[PDB]
Ligand binder design. Structure first.
Ligand SMILES: [Mg+2]
Ligand SMILES: [Mg+2]
Lengths: 200, 201
């Protein structure tokens, strides 16, 4: 909306005022990143939120500078579900994620970059139909995102296999109250999956 | 619309239920104006924690005190009411509900220092959140009563409003906002400057 536009500039202007240091562990993405208290979840003061609700691949791309100038230890990226909601193809989304990977590697070569599987979605709550109705695209993106990681020599994290239900290909509803965002237990699963990579 | 705000509240609330609160913790508690900051970064203080929920109202804050107060935090910083203003709620009923937050906090964690922060001015200039912005006058009505309440209950009143407002208009200085309601980074630096002395008492 005009709200997501305005919220973007609020969060982006704030991040411009906060220093990133070489010890930092950045979580970078859309609402699913924005929704967490990352330092609390890992109990690690070097872990920082660079999530913006409604963010898309090129929104993340356009605000790398206040993050990369700090040369953080780690970036955990989760992006693309909002690009799905706009009818963008997995291939187009992969090309944009490529720009982010290559920009990070060039501006901050020492940063460990971890590409996180797009999370599954679920239309069972009848919300975010632009997202939940393109549930098949989640798999499409990750089947390309993993080889993108191998080619660019960066880690791929499979969150998807944990959050997904075997026989639907949709978000386990115990992780979500809308089919898109995580409840507490959703972030506790994330924590258990990614924790070993926060402590590499 | 209100469904996304309702589900977002349960999302933030259930996460806070999994996040332990301790005797050293400094809590920023309130609505999207609290939610929007990275508090521990703003104050370079690992003890400072975000319990902001976009869209929250006084009774939404009241109903979620348990997982904050049971850890007996060092400080709570409260900023709440503008979403109640947006529902046509009177400054009197708002104060009434803020008074129940204050007594629950004292009762459950009496060593917790509580700080009551002036409700921030709004500005209809951007034509956004017209529920909030048309009612810019109700801001100062709440604050006229909020300072005497603090004094009554023996808790701090922090005046943010006098720094954010344009005295000529009675509205949010557009330099701190792109929508009439929420803060730009600059907005949060002005907030830090005002509150850091209370954060470090
Ligand atoms: Mg559920
Ligand atoms: Mg402005």
């Amino acid at each position: 909306e005009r709200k997501y536009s305005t919220f973007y500039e609020q969060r982006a202007t704030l991040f411009e005022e906060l220093p990133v240091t070489s010890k930092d562990i950045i979580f970078l993405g859309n609402s699913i990143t924005n929704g967490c208290e990352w330092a609390e979840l890992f109990q690690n003061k070097n872990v920082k939120n660079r999530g913006i609700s409604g963010d898309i691949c090129m929104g993340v791309y356009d605000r790398l500078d206040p993050i990369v100038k700090g040369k953080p230890a780690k970036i955990f990226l989760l992006i693309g579900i909002n690009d799905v909601s706009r009818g963008t193809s997995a291939d187009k989304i992969i090309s944009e994620i490529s720009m982010i990977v290559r920009k990070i590697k060039q501006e901050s070569p020492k940063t460990k970059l971890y590409l996180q599987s797009v999370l599954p979605v679920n239309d069972c709550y009848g919300m975010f139909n632009g997202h939940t109705s393109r549930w098949q695209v989640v798999k499409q993106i990750n089947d390309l995102l993993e080889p993108l990681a191998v080619k660019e020599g960066v880690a791929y994290i499979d969150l998807y296999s944990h959050f997904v239900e075997k026989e639907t290909g949709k978000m386990n509803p115990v992780y979500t109250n809308d089919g898109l965002h995580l409840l507490g237990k959703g972030y506790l699963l994330w924590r258990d999956i990614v924790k070993p990579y926060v402590d590499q």
